[PDB]
Amino acid sequence: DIVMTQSPSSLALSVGQKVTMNCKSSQSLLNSDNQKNYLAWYQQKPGQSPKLLIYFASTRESGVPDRFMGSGSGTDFNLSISSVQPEDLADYFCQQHYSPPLSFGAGTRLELKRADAAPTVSIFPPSSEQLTSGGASVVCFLNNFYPKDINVKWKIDGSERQNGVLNSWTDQDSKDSTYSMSSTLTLTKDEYERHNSYTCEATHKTSTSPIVKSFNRN
Amino acid sequence: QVQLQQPGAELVRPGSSVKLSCRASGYTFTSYWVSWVQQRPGQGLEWIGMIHPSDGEARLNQKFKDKATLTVDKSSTTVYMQLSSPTSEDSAVYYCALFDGYYPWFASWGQGTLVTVSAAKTTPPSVYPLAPGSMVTLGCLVKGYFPEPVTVTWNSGSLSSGVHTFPAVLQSDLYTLSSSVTVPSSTWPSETVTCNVAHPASSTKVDKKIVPRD
């Protein structure tokens, strides 16, 4: 099978900028017969299905604006946009149409650039209503931060905890272009009551130190 | 123009086979291959295989050889893909697509069917208030519901800004979701803050007040 490697995995850009995406194949996609490279490019907006942009590496599908530009040969290929518009903010995938099985790359995501924003971190203990049911969910919100690169860690009475933690992300906000994240550590009531200190830590660009929010059951 | 009609969503029980539908129009159905494409949540696209409605011949990606079965119904110009012994790993969007003529790239796609694998039944959510240990943040934990979706509002919409409702996570056949709201310190706990959760599938609509904690 032919393996397709895209990079980068995400790009923050400003409206009007030119942008370039890379797609490499584990073997040549060049057919000597017609000297054409068998690669296609797709755009997928959030919640939508893919849309064909380019085929044969550099041919646009009818109705595709000429700010989309496919180039490359053999095993190295690029997709460029001369002037990134707001509607271009989407996922982009390359596909080799050289031989079956048809294979794609993991994709590149374009996202709108903006000024750094510090996350607002909040930590919530388990509700009484939940404790009654013998469950214990400690919640931590990290809201309205940029960029999206962030590291969050739970600590119980000092030592880090990973197991029992489920995270959830929002898309780039349509208003302020920020990201928000949710982290929930679920324990048993029994387990929750074995410890006193519960900590939510975040390492972000806007801070040279870790953002530490914690609570003591006392 | 060409059309590929897929259902938006499909619920399937683990170990129970599901038959996905994709009705084709706008071209000679008996002349072109119809492909199936998988997209795991957050992951990329993966080609499953294709079937030719001329005689129902199928070619599968060997990775799904023992996973997927393709069938045709030429009386209703519909193509089907079936998943055997499905687990939660098979929860993804499944697209049917059509080649650009005889060129092996995809010029036409269906809307995609979101396949949720779960043996749970219509379960109502347990709504928990989250009171914190000069902007104060509150939250509601909407845990253990099935299926999607739920609706969360704060003070019946009066608080639209400062509200973050997060995508649900499927843990144990059940969905769990949380919502936060950020307000000035002067408004809580001095004033009333309420999250309104609606689970249409259960026909439930609960209101939970965020009360301070000594």
């Binding site: 996609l29 057919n31 017969d33 068998y38 149409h97 050289y98 031989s99 079956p100 | 002349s31 291959w33 030719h52 001329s54 011949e57 070619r59 080649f99 005889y102 060129y103 092996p104």
Partner: peptide, 15 residues
């Protein structure tokens, strides 16, 4: 046509 315009239709009887 079944024999799609691959550059190389591997594992098929389209040769």
């Amino acid at each position: 046509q079944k024999c799609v315009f691959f550059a190389e239709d591997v594992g098929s009887n389209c040769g």
